[PDB]
């Protein structure tokens, strides 16, 4: 009955899912070949002599990423038909994955999603991993969600998408891939979680205190977020939550569906001894502005709804004291129309650790998925960079020759500006 599929589109999707499926395989006692030496139903599928096939698709137009998991140590855990390759890289271009040859990928990707969905007692998740600013992350990410919207109507679309940073972009057309993706991400996905890179390099600076993390240490943290978010479907807990009611818990309005992510406690094994991590202090360590993973200050953003997922030996009564002292604390702004804005779920198992990872073993953990008005300020700075790209029409006519009409930048602009104005009128 419990069943969530994953759709990794883009090099960020394959790399994040590389950490996700190694974390999931070690947690259920699954070897890299797939067979264990009833909670595995929600992420895997039983077949043969206990050998488990993950309900997943690894999609990427270019090679050299998707063949890397076709040649690594996880080749023979995945079904080799959701491993999808093209030949041509989407080339950091939105219209290459949306208006020229990517149809040969999406026409059989819907076939593989249909085949995966005809394996299921009940569907409750559409976890899509991608980068916003990548060419195939925005390009095919737009086309897959519009195809799945008209195919599968009223189900939950999860989406953990990598927003570009305010400071670095690692590209000059990051505004050109962000406003186009958002213009069709408002109407297609249901839950959009913002992720952002040097929020989390700064996380690994002052908390994990290791001198060289990389993109792969980024993905291990994100996999810990997804594992605690969907742990309630796996194991029994004191207060079981469901992914299909995160949809009704967070969003107030049909167009307001952007939330945040933060994980705690995050302390390496050397400094995990001076203090005993209690429930009342991991909540304060997660609610602090320097622990969230999008580097937007919640001091100037009004909180709206908040959901906390617990993993370990935690009783609910010191949870009740912990959420009370957060609610009476003034440095976290709550808005006047919503006095009740907390949903806490509690699960029994302790969080798992990768063997010898930078994360230390801990008896309890909190994941926070929170809706706030501060997303309007992340979006208003990308708003400013889009006009300053469009001031003399730079990098626009290769999009025009790609297949988009010159002028759909205007209504993608007006959808983003309608996103700018409506959080302002909500916050009053």
């Amino acid at each position: 009955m419990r069943e969530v599929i994953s759709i990794h589109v883009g090099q960020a999707g394959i790399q994040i899912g590389n950490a996700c499926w190694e974390l999931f395989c070690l947690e259920h006692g699954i070897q890299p070949d797939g067979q264990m030496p009833d909670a595995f139903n929600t992420f895997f599928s039983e077949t043969g002599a206990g050998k488990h096939v993950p309900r997943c698709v690894f999609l990427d137009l270019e090679p050299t990423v998707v063949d890397e998991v076709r040649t690594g140590t996880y080749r023979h855990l995945f079904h080799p038909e959701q491993l999808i390759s093209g030949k041509e890289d989407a080339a950091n271009n939105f219209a290459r994955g949306h208006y020229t040859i990517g149809k040969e990928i999406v026409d059989l990707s819907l076939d593989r999603i249909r085949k995966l969905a005809d394996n299921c007692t009940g569907l409750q998740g559409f976890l899509m991993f991608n980068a916003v600013g990548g060419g195939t992350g925005s390009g095919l990410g737009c086309l897959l969600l519009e195809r799945l919207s008209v195919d599968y109507g009223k189900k939950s679309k999860l989406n953990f998408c990598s927003w570009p940073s305010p400071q670095v972009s690692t590209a000059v057309v990051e505004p050109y891939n962000s406003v186009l993706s958002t213009h069709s991400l408002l109407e297609h996905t249901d839950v959009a979680v913002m992720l952002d890179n040097e929020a989390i390099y700064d996380i690994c600076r002052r908390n994990l205190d290791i001198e060289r993390p990389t993109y792969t240490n980024l993905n291990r943290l994100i996999a810990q977020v997804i594992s605690s978010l969907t742990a309630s479907l796996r194991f029994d807990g004191a207060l079981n939550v469901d992914v299909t009611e995160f949809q009704t818990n967070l969003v107030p309005y049909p167009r307001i569906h952007f939330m945040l992510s933060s994980y705690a406690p995050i302390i390496s094994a050397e400094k995990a001894y001076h203090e005993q991590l209690s429930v009342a202090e991991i909540t304060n360590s997660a609610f602090e502005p320097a622990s969230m993973m999008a580097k937007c200050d919640p001091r100037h953003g009004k909180y709206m709804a908040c959901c906390l997922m617990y993993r370990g030996d935690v009783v609910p009564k010191d949870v009740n004291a912990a959420v009370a002292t957060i609610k009476t604390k003034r440095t976290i702004q709550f808005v006047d129309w919503c006095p009740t804005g907390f949903k806490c779920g509690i699960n029994y198992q302790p969080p798992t650790v990768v063997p010898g990872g930078d994360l230390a073993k801990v008896m309890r953990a909190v994941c926070m998925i929170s809706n706030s008005t501060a997303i309007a300020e992340v979006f208003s700075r990308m708003d400013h960079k889009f006009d300053l790209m469009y001031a003399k029409r730079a990098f626009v006519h290769w999009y025009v020759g790609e297949g988009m009409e010159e002028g759909e930048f205007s209504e993608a602009r007006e959808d983003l500006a309608a996103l700018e104005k409506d959080y302002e009128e909500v916050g009053i």
């Binding site: 950490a19 890299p32 690594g72 063997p355």
Partner: protein, 63 residues
């Protein structure tokens, strides 16, 4: 001098060539092993201490 020429500032070769995905995302019980040889691993107190309550706190769950 070198064994690789002018561009080679020193000698590493292709024998030291793997990727981050191949070197790090190798099988996990293997990754337990070579790290085992190189270093793998209001306050509330126990019921012994006479801080907060200690009479009825000792009885249902002794510690």
């Amino acid at each position: 001098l070198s064994k690789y020429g002018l561009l080679g500032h020193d000698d590493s070769g292709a024998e030291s060539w793997t990727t981050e995905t191949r070197s790090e995302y190798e099988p996990p019980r293997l990754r337990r092993d070579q790290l085992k040889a190189a270093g793998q691993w209001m306050a509330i107190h126990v019921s012994r201490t006479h801080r907060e309550d200690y009479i009825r706190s000792l009885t249902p769950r002794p510690a």
